[PDB]
Amino acid sequence: KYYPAYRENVPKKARKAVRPTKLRASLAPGTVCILLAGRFRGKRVVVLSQLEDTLVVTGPYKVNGVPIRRVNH
RNA sequence: GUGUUUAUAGCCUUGUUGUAAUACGUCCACUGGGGACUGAGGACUGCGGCUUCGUGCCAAGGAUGCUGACAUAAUGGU
C-alpha cells in the first residue's frame, strides 16, 4: 500500500520561513487593555504576557470575572 | 492741526554682527506604520545573500504556517 499509486504531484519547495510575530509597542505586559470581541466584549483586562501571536490576558477574577485567557492582538 | 528727525515710539535704506535658519527643487541601492486585491507554478537544478565550511540557513526561478467553527449544519445552486 506504500508505493505511490498516482502521479504524486509533490509540492515544490516553498521558501516560507516562520518568524516571530512583531506585536505593537503599546501591547506591553501589564498594560490595561479593552477586549473587543468574544463573550467578554467590553471588559478591561490586564495583559500578563505575550504568546507567539496572542496576548495571555486576564482581568483579576475577583474584579471582572475574566479568567486566564488568550486574546488575539 | 503746522513743522519735526528718536526724544519718553520707532520706520525705511545702507553697509554690516557669529553664522545661519527656513521654504522650495532634487536625490538616498535611508527608514517606520495602516489598507486592499492576488497565491499562478508544483521533487531537484538557476541567479544571489548570509555562512570558517556546512545532505547549513535565507524574504534568492509564484503561500505557507498556527488555529477555530459543522453533518439532524455549514456553504452554494435553482
From Swiss-Prot:
Tell me the superkingdom of the source.
Eukaryota
The entry's localization annotation reads: Cytoplasm; Nucleus; Nucleus, Nucleolus
Q: What is the lineage of its organism?
A: Eukaryota, Fungi, Dikarya, Ascomycota, Taphrinomycotina
Q: What does this protein do?
A: Component of the ribosome, a large ribonucleoprotein complex responsible for the synthesis of proteins in the cell. The small ribosomal subunit (SSU) binds messenger RNAs (mRNAs) and translates the encoded message by selecting cognate aminoacyl-transfer RNA (tRNA) molecules. The large subunit (LSU) contains the ribosomal catalytic site termed the peptidyl transferase center (PTC), which catalyzes the formation of peptide bonds, thereby polymerizing the amino acids delivered by tRNAs into a polypeptide chain.
| Subunit text | Component of the large ribosomal subunit (LSU). Mature yeast ribosomes consist of a small (40S) and a large (60S) subunit. The 40S small subunit contains 1 molecule of ribosomal RNA (18S rRNA) and at least 33 different proteins. The large 60S subunit contains 3 rRNA molecules (25S, 5.8S and 5S rRNA) and at least 46 different proteins.
Q: Which family does it belong to?
A: Belongs to the eukaryotic ribosomal protein eL6 family.
This protein is called: Large ribosomal subunit protein eL6
